């Protein structure tokens, strides 16, 4: 299958120890203190449209943002070989399941707190000699890596071949029809995180084809009148829950396979991704693919945070790197509505209408995060919000280039 994941631990943002305390270990949903196979656990049972977030976890990406620093704080293996222990907490045994208090009689060595520790994976020989059991850990660490190599939104990866969708892909995809993007992220992740799959498996090339097929919809290029291969995502009114996507199937005028491969990493600069279940789902839904199949190439050092500068085997700067086109939710959806008007889906009156109904919605996202960062600073201890600063929220980077990527990805 695959066994060689190069990771990278979360940044401290200038804080002493990793941003999380003792209580985070016995609060995680699902399997006790087991951080593995968590993420989409608090969403296992849907009650309604309202995004699941409590007091300690003020947002959607709050559950994951916490399991990240909690994850890295206990990742001496792959980066040292030992098991160590942070604040009296360690793994049960070599398989690395749930975290229990440091066992007596033979306690592990105390972990040396460090920021951004490069994970080699092969450094821990027990991993490959017990792959079929500790496989989820590979998918999860990969997630933490994509989240760590960015101070503003998880950097996933789109692709799309030069030729049309395989004959085994079109038959597998016709099963995730009436399924929201929020759920596609849950089924995608829970798939690549329980049993060692192959890089050329049917469910892998289809889930990847489902992610890049989602980006076009998010940009508006793959609407109701322009399918990639009969699949798209119908968006509801932004004032009436814009989180709803669903992979609808039609028989309209399909697009056409591009002249070349459109491999490209994408990011969401705007801190809006934090509270948007749709953005967090789109990110983690793509990460499920780069898990079973390590990074197709290296990531561009063009922008990114000041700590992801020249990583071991993650972010480069030469010619073997792939540019990262980052966008912004508000301008992206503002350009997404503009696509619908061009082909005649919406009236020229609903053009400037959907913009005001969405910008008001995205405002609620901004009014929420700003009010949560102040409530939960950073020097306090944890980092459920991630210090984004209020100077941003609307400084859209090359979002205009991400849109031009979708037009090129589906000619």
């Amino acid at each position: 299958a695959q066994r060689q994941f190069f990771g990278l631990t979360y940044n401290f943002y200038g804080q002493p120890a990793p941003l999380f305390d003792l209580n985070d270990l016995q609060e995680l949903a699902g399997c006790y203190a087991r951080p593995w196979t968590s993420r989409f656990s608090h969403l296992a049972i849907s009650t309604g449209s309202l995004p699941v977030w409590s007091a300690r976890y003020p947002s959607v990406a709050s559950r994951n943002i916490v399991v990240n620093t909690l994850l890295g704080a206990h990742l001496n293996p792959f980066a040292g070989g030992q098991i160590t222990s942070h604040q009296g907490i360690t793994w049960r045994d070599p398989v690395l399941s749930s975290l229990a208090p440091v066992p007596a009689i033979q306690p592990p060595p105390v972990w040396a707190v460090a920021e951004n520790v490069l994970l080699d994976s092969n450094n821990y020989p027990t991993y490959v000699l017990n792959l079929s059991s500790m496989w989820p850990i590979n998918q999860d660490v990969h997630i933490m890596t994509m989240w760590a190599l960015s101070d503003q939104g998880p950097i996933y990866h789109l692709e799309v071949p030069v030729d049309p969708m395989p004959a085994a892909t079109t038959a597998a995809l016709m099963a995730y029809t009436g399924v929201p993007i929020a759920h596609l992220a849950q089924t995608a992740y829970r798939f690549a995180g329980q049993l060692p799959q192959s890089p050329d498996s049917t469910m892998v090339s289809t889930i990847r084809w489902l992610s890049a097929i989602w980006f076009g919809s998010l940009t508006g290029r793959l609407n109701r009148s322009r399918t990639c291969n009969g699949f798209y995502f119908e968006f509801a009114k932004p004032a009436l829950n814009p989180d709803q996507a669903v992979l609808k199937w039609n028989d309209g005028a399909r697009a056409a396979p591009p002249a070349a491969a459109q491999s490209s990493y994408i990011r969401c600069i705007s801190p809006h991704w934090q509270h948007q279940i749709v953005e967090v789902a789109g990110a983690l839904m793509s990460q499920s693919v780069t898990a079973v199949t390590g990074l197709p190439a290296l990531i561009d050092e063009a922008t990114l945070p000041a700590w992801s500068q020249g990583v071991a085997n993650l972010t480069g700067n030469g010619q073997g790197v792939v540019p990262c086109l980052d966008y912004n939710p508000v301008p992206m959806a503002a350009a997404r509505h503009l696509q619908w008007r061009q082909d005649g889906l919406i009236t020229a009156a609903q053009e400037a209408q959907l913009n005001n109904d969405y910008t008001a919605y995205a405002l609620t996202i901004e009014r929420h995060l700003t009010a949560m960062l102040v409530a939960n600073p950073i020097a306090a201890g944890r980092m459920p919000i991630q210090p984004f600063n209020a100077a941003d929220f609307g400084q859209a980077g090359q979002t205009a280039a991400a849109v031009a990527l979708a037009q090129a990805m589906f000619v």
Binding site: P166, A167, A168, T169, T170, A171, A172, A175, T202
Partner: protein, 48 residues
């Protein structure tokens, strides 16, 4: 010819022939659906 899937080494999971020749040994996709049957609580609005 009837069995391009079973015999031929260049088969491609999911590839038919359909319009022209009914293939026998193919590659179907066995599903395992569950049918959730909702039954929730229902609160009224309350005088005021």
């Amino acid at each position: 010819l009837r069995w391009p899937g079973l015999v031929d080494p260049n088969y491609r999971v999911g590839t038919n022939d359909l319009p022209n020749r009914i293939t026998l040994y193919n590659s179907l996709y066995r599903y395992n659906f569950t049918y959730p049957t909702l039954d929730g609580i229902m609160y009224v609005r309350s005088a005021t």
